[PDB]
UniProtKB/Swiss-Prot annotation, chain A:
One of the primary rRNA binding proteins, it binds directly to 16S rRNA where it helps nucleate assembly of the platform of the 30S subunit central domain. The combined cluster of proteins S8, S12 and S17 appears to hold together the shoulder and platform of the 30S subunit. Belongs to the universal ribosomal protein uS8 family. GO terms for molecular function: rRNA binding; structural constituent of ribosome. One of its GO terms (cellular component) is ribonucleoprotein complex. Part of the 30S ribosomal subunit. Contacts proteins S2, S5 and S12. Keywords: Ribonucleoprotein, Ribosomal protein, RNA-binding, rRNA-binding. This is Small ribosomal subunit protein uS8. Signal peptide: none annotated. HAMAP family: Ribosomal_uS8_B. It comes from Thermus thermophilus (strain ATCC 27634 / DSM 579 / HB8). One of its GO terms (biological process) is translation. InterPro entries: Ribosomal_uS8, Ribosomal_uS8_CS, Ribosomal_uS8_sf.
UniProtKB/Swiss-Prot annotation, chain B:
Part of the 30S ribosomal subunit. Contacts protein S8 and may contact the N-terminus of Era. Disulfide bonds: none annotated. One of its GO terms (cellular component) is cytosolic small ribosomal subunit. Pfam families: Ribosomal_S2. The gene is rpsB. Keywords: Coiled coil, Ribonucleoprotein, Ribosomal protein, RNA-binding, rRNA-binding. This is Small ribosomal subunit protein uS2. Spans the head-body hinge region of the 30S subunit. Is loosely associated with the 30S subunit. The keyword Ribosomal protein applies. PANTHER family: 30S RIBOSOMAL PROTEIN S2 PROKARYOTIC AND ORGANELLAR (PTHR12534), SMALL RIBOSOMAL SUBUNIT PROTEIN US2M (PTHR12534:SF0).
RNA sequence: GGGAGCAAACCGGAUUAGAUACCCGGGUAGUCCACGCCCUAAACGAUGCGCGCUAGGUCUCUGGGUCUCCUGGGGGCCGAAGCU
RNA sequence: GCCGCGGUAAUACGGAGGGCGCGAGCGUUACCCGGAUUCACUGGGCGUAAAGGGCGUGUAGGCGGCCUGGGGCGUCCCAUGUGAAAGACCACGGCUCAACCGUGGGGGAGCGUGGGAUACGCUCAGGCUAGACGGUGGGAGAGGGUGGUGGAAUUCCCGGAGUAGCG
């Protein structure tokens, strides 16, 4: 039944990236698209697209990876090293603007739902607003 | 000129004996055997040889490895037919990583070499004589190929790489470009430039070792006639 | 209620310094039926339940296919990534 | 203090010479926090280390797929009241310095009142079919209960034959 779509979405990404999967799908939801829209914009993915499997809406996510390297294990470094759900369904998390985090010293990002759509650490901070901390990405 | 030759008897190989990472490089599984896409191989030999050629015309040496039985002799030739080094017999341990020390076997081979019809055999008992003759024998047996190179190669060419996994390690630890001819059998992951095709039929083996050195010589100057292949094709 | 076989306890013979054992000859509950209690366990995969996701190879039980095979459910072995 | 030291050559006991620390103090004992991510929200775990409930069924509770609006409780933002003094924090001075001591500044989570936002959560209303249940048609099975029945063998009794041992 999936208790949280989001946390699985992120995971599927975390999971697809690990094997260097060209793309990977994930069942669709307007709120997810909103997320993924920031993931691409912030340069974590090439992007995505609405697709169809047996009539059912998915989102093919096109993943971005590092360049190939030398030495043993040539496996390219990642664009998404680590992606982790924050406000889970049991333990929800909220923050006013003054309380927002600076992810990885700012190299990474914190995403978050607010009354004004899904924003980021800088955006929201700048807008002057807060809301449910969703997840952290780097 | 390229796939027309290969479509003779030189494409597809293993059957469910395989490795899933060889995915992009495949066309169909007809006959329960995995048949590799040559149209993709075309585009590969291209980019492969771009590097090989580059290395050739800059006078940068290449070590050939082929221990497997249905491909040994085919190596001894091409390599000497380009004054470059090989390994026909057992892929010894630390040839590259402990080169330092394997190298000091050649600084014994040439020490025995300066004695094969010479005034010192006068001396030394018959014990040492046949013994040292029998030493040089195998000494020679393994380090005929490995010898021509007296300092780490800029790259390595290989047949079945899963069959010479030891080698691929040594090199790759030293950042030595790995290039090789591998198939379904083996994984593309850890080869820097790959010739994806049949690693068993002398047919497909030879054809690839042929046009290999040919391009070594053409980038060096003055291509000659082809060398032995139809030893006994049945 | 039943009781052939087996068998704690129990008794005989052995062995042994000793032999309340190990081996041998017997042997009572019990083992079985019904009905009612008892509620424990190396009750062990020593691995709570449901879901989604992340290479494949090999043999096996059971179903479905316009059945060299493809698909679904279950039981083992070897193992990608990863974890330890 | 913990690991430990002393059995005839002890840097660990006792004295001595020297040396390290701190200094009108220096040590001990007690107790609080710390180190202890050793009750773990931040920040731990349970195959074999201590840790999966013997297994089901379900009550309260916790949690909740996709889509559209109504509300705006959670949630966020804005203003404003409150958030005493002393303290702490920053400046600046008064004691010769300091400890003390004054002046001024800067704010405080909370909670009260107003305005606002609607993404997430909640709530009302509607819709969908991927979750879940139902329908038809088939299949494998030492799943359970009751009733009935077969043969192999052990044991005992009755009959026959047979003899010096069996075990």
């Amino acid at each position: 039944m999936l208790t949280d779509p989001i946390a699985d979405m992120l995971t599927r990404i975390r999971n697809a990236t690990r094997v260097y999967k060209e793309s990977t799908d994930v069942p669709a939801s307007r709120f997810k698209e909103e997320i993924l829209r920031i993931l691409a914009r912030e340069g974590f993915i090439k992007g995505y697209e609405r697709v169809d499997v047996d009539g059912k809406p998915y989102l093919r996510v096109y993943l971005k990876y590092g360049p190939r390297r030398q030495g043993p294990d040539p496996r390219p470094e990642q664009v998404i090293h680590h992606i982790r759900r924050i406000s889970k369904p049991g333990r929800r998390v909220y923050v006013g603007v003054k309380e927002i985090p600076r992810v990885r010293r700012g190299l990474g990002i914190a995403i978050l739902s607010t009354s004004k759509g899904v924003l980021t650490d800088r955006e929201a901070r700048k807008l002057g607003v807060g809301g449910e901390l969703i997840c952290e990405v780097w | 000129v390229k796939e027309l030759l290969e479509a003779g008897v030189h494409f597809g190989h293993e059957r469910k004996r395989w490795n899933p990472k060889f995915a992009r490089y495949i066309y169909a599984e007809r006959n329960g055997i995995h048949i590799i896409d040559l149209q993709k191989t075309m585009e590969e030999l291209e980019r492969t040889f771009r590097f090989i050629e580059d290395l050739a015309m800059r006078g940068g040496t290449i070590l050939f490895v082929g221990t497997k039985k249905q491909a040994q002799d085919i190596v001894r030739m091409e390599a000497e037919r380009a004054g470059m080094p090989y390994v026909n017999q057992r892929w010894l341990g630390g040839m590259l990583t402990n080169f330092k020390t394997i190298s000091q076997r050649v600084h014994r081979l040439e020490e025995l070499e300066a004695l094969f019809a010479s005034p010192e055999i006068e001396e030394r008992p018959k014990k040492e004589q046949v013994r040292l003759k029998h030493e040089l024998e195998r000494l020679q047996k393994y380090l005929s190929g490995f010898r021509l190179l007296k300092r780490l190669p800029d790259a390595i060419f290989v047949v079945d790489p899963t069959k010479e996994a030891i080698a691929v390690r040594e090199a790759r630890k030293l950042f030595i470009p790995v290039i090789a001819l591998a198939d379904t059998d083996s994984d593309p992951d850890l080869v820097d430039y790959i010739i994806p095709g049949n690693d068993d039929a002398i047919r497909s083996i030879q054809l690839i070792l042929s046009r290999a050195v040919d391009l070594i010589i053409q980038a060096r100057g003055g291509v000659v006639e082809p060398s032995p292949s139809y030893a006994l094709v049945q």
